Design a binder for this molecule. Sequence first.
Ligand SMILES: Cc1cn([C@H]2C[C@H](OP(=O)(O)O)[C@@H](COP(=O)(O)O)O2)c(=O)[nH]c1=O
Ligand SMILES: [Ca+2]
Length: 129
Amino acid sequence: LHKEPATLIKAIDGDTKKLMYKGQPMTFRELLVDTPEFNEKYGPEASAFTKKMVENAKKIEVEFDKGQRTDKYGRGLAYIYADGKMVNEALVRQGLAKVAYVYKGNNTHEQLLRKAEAQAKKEKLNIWS
Ligand SMILES: Cc1cn([C@H]2C[C@H](OP(=O)(O)O)[C@@H](COP(=O)(O)O)O2)c(=O)[nH]c1=O
Ligand SMILES: [Ca+2]
């Protein structure tokens, strides 16, 4: 896998955001995670977490996996990095997302995120409290 440039257009919620990629606006959906919706428990905190992480970043990068790059809704499916730090992983590590939607062909960072979830679950953080 490799990292590609992108710029933040706008935070949306825990696991989606509007980025400019190859000069075009797209909604990105984070691979391998599920944040609660804004109206659910920990939803506002997920959105806040993701929003801060991507808004404070100097450099946003996207990393596609080996499989499908866009979902049925036209959302790009990628791993998102903010100053080299994976948003998908940080959400999981803090208990603000669950590992989810693990499809074959698009699961390179699965075990990395599962390790992060275990740690969150041990620490009883947020969703696991
Ligand atoms: C994360 C991800 C979601 N999706 C689709 C499956 C789900 O379909 P349904 O809309 O039919 O439930 C939906 C979940 O996204 P959200 O969690 O953003 O709603 O997005 C994929 O197709 N591939 C993926 O990698
Ligand atoms: Ca969600």
